[model samples]
Target chain A: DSKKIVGVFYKANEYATKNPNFLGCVENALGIRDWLESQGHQYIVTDDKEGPDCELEKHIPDLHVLISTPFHPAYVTAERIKKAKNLKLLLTAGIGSDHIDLQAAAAAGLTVAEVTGSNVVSVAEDELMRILILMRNFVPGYNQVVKGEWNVAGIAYRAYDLEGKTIGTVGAGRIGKLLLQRLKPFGCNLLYHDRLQMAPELEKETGAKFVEDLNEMLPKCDVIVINMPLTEKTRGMFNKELIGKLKKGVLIVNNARGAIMERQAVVDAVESGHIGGYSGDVWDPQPAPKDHPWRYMPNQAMTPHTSGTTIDAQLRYAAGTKDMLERYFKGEDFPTENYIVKDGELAPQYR
Target chain B: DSKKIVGVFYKANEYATKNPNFLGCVENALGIRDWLESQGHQYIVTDDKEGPDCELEKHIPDLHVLISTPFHPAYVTAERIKKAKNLKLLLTAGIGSDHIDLQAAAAAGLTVAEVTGSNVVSVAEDELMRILILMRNFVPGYNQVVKGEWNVAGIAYRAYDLEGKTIGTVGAGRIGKLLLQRLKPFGCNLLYHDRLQMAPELEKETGAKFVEDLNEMLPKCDVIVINMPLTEKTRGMFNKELIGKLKKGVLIVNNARGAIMERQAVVDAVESGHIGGYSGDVWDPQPAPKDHPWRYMPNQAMTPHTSGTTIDAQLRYAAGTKDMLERYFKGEDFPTENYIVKDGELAPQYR
Candidate 1:
């Protein structure tokens, strides 16, 4: 038996000193340090993930297993994969593995796995919250309360009920299906556009109609949610031209990858009031530079990518990651659905 | 035909000049001025509704009908009702007649009515939004984006999903029932405490178990929503003693009435970390003073009383008010359910 070095990347928590349950932070190492160390493995955790001189790069040459979260992703580029000769497995503590070059991982015979369905409910709940926030014109009201101003008309003029409105999702995958189920009793006209249609029973249960064309679904939606995976064909999908097809004053909730949309296109639409509101946790870059226009966009409810990393989700994915690691050490397979890239092939969604 | 004087009170809106659909503002007069003036009635609209020398008080003596919204309520106190000689109807453009003295109105043989069921969906949607906002620790994340920082761990540490948590409602009336229905698909354990249990089929449909004793239901709830009306017995019901019975770190969403909770008790609970979060749109003494403690309270998502006054809700209630006014002019009866106090008797719930 040989000793293995595992490198982990997570967001730094200066505030973790006060909260003991902050296990998702770089300082806590997902509470995996003791277990790995007792098994004769070395665990290195850091938040410095960018550029060639970063801490993650220093460990790349010897890191047999690499772990990261979508909230603070460690982008595993093809060049980084080439330098990691000892890397056998790539693990995502939460959902989504787009940060890693899937094709490169597949070519390198590296197995990539994520805790599937770990945070679907977390993200679906966030989507509904964002949709309601934008539609109800909530942020301005909360801001007024915090600023010690009371102005009801200013918020009510733009506020609307989600009932009787048409809501569409770009993908009817796990998260989208959950969102649809949650929104069913709101009495909304639900629609979905996915690569493949969902089962008939599911469609009836969620009361979401499948639109064959994405363009056909755009104009009918009062609110649109993006739940599809980020792929080469879908990158920059919501650019100026595609965004133009949407009805003016439409609200959008995108918890999917930020690269799926052209950053400027969203800012422009929000600025011109064509897009009434835009709210989600995804950003173009993992840390989105300080000057990102979305930070100052009007009627926007942007948050750093933390939807899938709630404390509850963190507990779940952390346990799942530990289980996967145990299985990997014993030469066993992970759950069939957890594989993103395995045995020289990428997952269907990624491919 | 005899000419009648109608006094209306609503919040002032300087921004109404840009949006004509803002019918609930004092400037728009709930879009009823044209119809009232066409019938040769004296129509007076004002936002000043506080003291004896206020515009509403000046019109009290001659006003045959008075209308107001809970958002900017003109408190029709017993003293004011005694001052008015010709006041026949006390109309609430929106729900909640707590702003009006129900016993005084009933004793004076005045028919007090609101737009029944007009904004239940609006308020229910808002309650769900606030619950999710507090549960997921969303505001801090949004604030970080606006402040140009990316601190995932800070937000993630406090965030959680609503799926597995137990959510309870203090009342199982119209809005509460709708909220239960909407929350059904979220896979939450639903509980309700009400004066009367819901019908068997309805209870089965919502999957909510009715707890006869309010105190018995408090400790089990991870989240509690207040949806009961404010009456003499209900005022300051959620005092420090009652709040102490709740599970620590529990969330509370109250769209019912601010007077239903002892204000300082809520602030203290939030500060002491007993109440993890508090959110609602209602505030005691309409137009809470800038120094209101809720404005500065931590983990609160407070808003002015605007939840039931969205554009959609405004349109519905405005039309409902017009229809009620038409019935009054024709010497016909109003909708039985809309009457909070009529013909020398208060509504059962209020009584």
Candidate 2:
């Protein structure tokens, strides 16, 4: 049998030199170099994915397998898919496969899979932290400390307790359900809107009522979280009109995807105080441009797309990716839920 | 039927002019001026309470009642107690009455009361938020976003999930117990050390083990929270020797009282990376000076002491203070738990 070529694209690590456990960086290559080399396979790692002269484009023609992460994704466009004649597998090192064009991969008969449930806990934990950050008005208080100021009233007037606030999630999937469980003890009025209702036991356990219409849920929420996947239907779903339906001064957290919201709409809403605060680790572009308006917006807690790529999450996804690669080499099928595109069909969620 | 003079010292709010719900500021006077003035009582509100020539000192001798908040406490010294010969009661708008000299108030036969349980939920929620902030390394990520930079590796290198970490609290009082309950769903290994154990049912519900010896719990914790009251014994308890007992790279949160820790010890520990991160709203001085080393320390998520003074908490503590004042006017005893120094003695927790 002929040896295969595995190409990996991850963010460059200028800051993780001292931390050897940071295996997700391009330098460490998910710690899969030794194993892949031992199996007589050629493993190529690079941080460059865009432009015609980029390293990733040069190898697209002969690559047998390609790996990427949500934190620093390699956007596999239709053009790149058409160039990759030998590509048979597309693997996401972490959850969410929106970076790759699902229709292009499906039509090309490439098996697209992700390490399912790998970063769910990490993303859910980040969502809860952002909620608290917005509700408590934490960033401004922290800024006051750093700037050598002590003004309690400046932070307290806008600050609030998460208790007694009505919070809702747009989708009640694994991450949303986990978030509901975490928020149960906070004495909040929990609500969820999804295509299908959750199991009765789960609803009772999390103490979250299902609202069939998202429009109805938006008006009642003091805080709204976007947990649904990005699809044609969900992209730009939170436009000006839908956001205006929310209670004024409502906090919004979107860890699922940034494209799910209209970018200008969020900036305008936050500027007008219709949205009290906005926070998330995900942005429309993986590495937001320096001039991104969200960077300069008021009452924002935005971070780089890093929440789902924590050290613990890195360890989980790295191991899960290795397991799937082993199965691929042995002609074995992946876990059913890990498949986003298999046999020329999109996953039910994407559809 | 002489008119009683009540003096209040709260932080001034130059930023809360539009927020009428901001009752804790000196400008709003906890929203009690109307009611007190209607009853023929003289009410005075000021943010100035420091020097001998301060406004509060001018009325100290004539003040029949004094009200303040922990966020901007007026240090009622022994000298002030001697001058306040007409003072019959001292009320704290929020929890923690440490700013008032307990022994001086007891010797002067002045009743000391605070709105207990009013800000417990707020402080506990802040503590959990700080814990996640430190564990996931959220501040630097936020800093990056604000600086118009996107670097996931910088934040993801230190970020982690709180799922399997061992977290301990120094005290298991109302705030501490609430914090434990809120942390239950995060799947952390919880431990606590107090003078006495919690009820069996509570221990089972929160899944926290009680450690009789403080030394036994310190080394095992990846994160430690200070929730104990500051007294003669507890003040400066987390000095160099005690903090050295903690695990290296341990995170610490102190929302209880800043005086409970040795100020310089914390700065040195964080500088050396022995303390991976430190966050809280409490400081040794209520309004920490501009040059406070903590404000400039590395790997910190600090804020001013505003955690317990949130709008929701202000509403709660303000209502509770009003209730207590009404009872005082009618010559009735207050809620027993609200009394910190009554009948020339300290509360059980303080003693």
Candidate 3:
């Protein structure tokens, strides 16, 4: 029980045994499991990650190290961190550990960590795909095909090419930077309204210009990509007043988090033609209610929050999780990059 | 009254009026009304063709030249062909003249012609897009965005890269060859099942193959494009059994014609997962019935036969139609490439 390692997946069935890598390339499920087991260290990999029924919750009391992914985070409530007397380290198998309530982790003397850059490329690629899908109105046209009705006029009324469009990202973080870089070949004028501008080399490579004023960016961009992390400042960031000022037929894509946009307001904007399309890989509440208003909104392209879970991403994060567990088992200092917080205080946000 | 020409649009008001040549665009509602009055010739344009209330049915009596688009084909039935006593010329302002029965047109001494090569680039570009959309399961991921859900697992389950997939086409005509040439950068293997192959130099230049036997070639391809004309031999060519022979999860595109594939069977194949996806611009009877099973089929990317409706294509075809009118006004021989029939026999297809 003192042996140190733990992993979490959203579902038990997500394990793909057909892959070339162990745990079918999801190292957290199999590769890490095998590596830790061979070393006589305990590795608890389970799908029951939420609620009292989860093995993760049951074992957390004695655990020395814990690992989880953003896809299914272990909330690590202040009370639980207080109860887990021997807990030495916490690691995220993938990016973002907002689920841990970082402020509480700071007070509880818990060092929070995540595998930064683990899945940025995977997410950036998905963003490109979503942008193209929205610009082309590919979903509705395909749906008509499924319906067996041929309404060319109806389809053509909305379909458009991607050339000569303005794309703006709200935050120029890891994933957003990669997205802008990938978009260079398509020749779109990229715009960003982030707190910190990216390095000059990247600005040159992506051909992205920083818009200093948030309000000024609204009317200029044809497509807006939200890439900022969820925070008190960012929650419900795109309010009615902001959306009201947007150009007609503006597209909004939120890959960083969904809590930033008011759901009902965004829905109405899309229906009223103020927003031409909406695509995202995040949601306000994970496992969103089946009939969320955004789901039924006209001209919207929404999906459950799962953009970073590609096969390649799963494998990389799993290995990164195993490496963290190995360091924990030896009671050694963690990799500086993997350690979001050490003794106390907040980790650097840029990392 | 006798008008020198008549023009019809599927929906004239909505077509991009911003285009430089918007003045020359056609509208079925305005019909041949003004042109006939001004030119001292008779004509009519309408969406309706069934009865006394329909302008099409009434105007066929003296319409010397009838022009229509593939979007809203004036299905010149055999009975109507016989009734159109003075209808000497039938022109399709765009591609695909299948709406006019070839046998009926020939027997009635009507010269059937369309603006050939007018929209090949547009249609081929669209075909390549549809192929990628299906191959990568682009629609489902996009639907998640429209529906306001973001299940990364569900989207990743179906998405894949287009690289290394073997793709074949039924014909190596203008659209097919252009599609092959465009797909060259995607690193896909290209094959064409054509009765006659293109020049070796062209094939080498484009990196495509000529497969004379479609059956032998089906199982080898991951994507199959139908660009061949829907002839007696080609119609109903991809039925239940023929589709069964294709590679499981193979993507199929029919930019050629919907009649080439039996409707219900295609639906069955797509539902049964025997066919990964199916797409085409042409339908058996377009403005396809709302009840058509394809309108609601899963795993297919269908559109309203709009591959050739770009602003540029519109100009090309409109000019071609006008060129034909100038030739007719002068009483000179029509362009050789524009001739569908001569001396009571059909000219070699597009030669």
Name the candidate that leads on lDDT: 2
Cα lDDT listed for each candidate = 0.87, 0.88, 0.71
Model 3 misplaced regions, further than 4 Å = A12-32, A50-54, A85-89, A101-113, A142-150, A163-237, A319-339, A342-347, B1-4, B8-43, B51-54, B76-89, B101-112, B117-156, B159-256, B259-347
The CA lDDT at A137 in model 2 is 96
Better of 1 and 3 by DockQ: 1
DockQ of each: 0.73, 0.79, 0.23
- Rank order by lDDT, top first? 2, 1, 3
Model 1, runs deviating above 4 Å: A11-19, A37-40, A48-63, A74-86, A98-108, A231-234, A237-245, A343-351, B11-14, B37-42, B48-63, B75-86, B98-109, B231-242, B341-351
Kindly report the root-mean-square deviation of model 3 from the true structure over all alpha carbons.
5.9
Give the docking tier of candidate 1. medium
lDDT of candidate 2 over A156-247, digit per residue (tens): 87899999999999998999999999999999999999988999998898899999988888899999999998889999998999889889
For candidate 2, write residues B1-351 as lDDT tens digits. 344655465655565575777888778888888999998888888888889898889889878888988766788889999998688889998886768899899888988999988888999999999999999999999999888887777788889999999999999998999999999999999999998899999999999999999999999999999999888989999889988888988999999888898999999989988899999888877678998899999999999988888899999888988998898888898999899988667777766
Interface RMSD per candidate (angstroms): 1.5, 1.2, 4.5
Which residue pairs come into collision in candidate 1? none
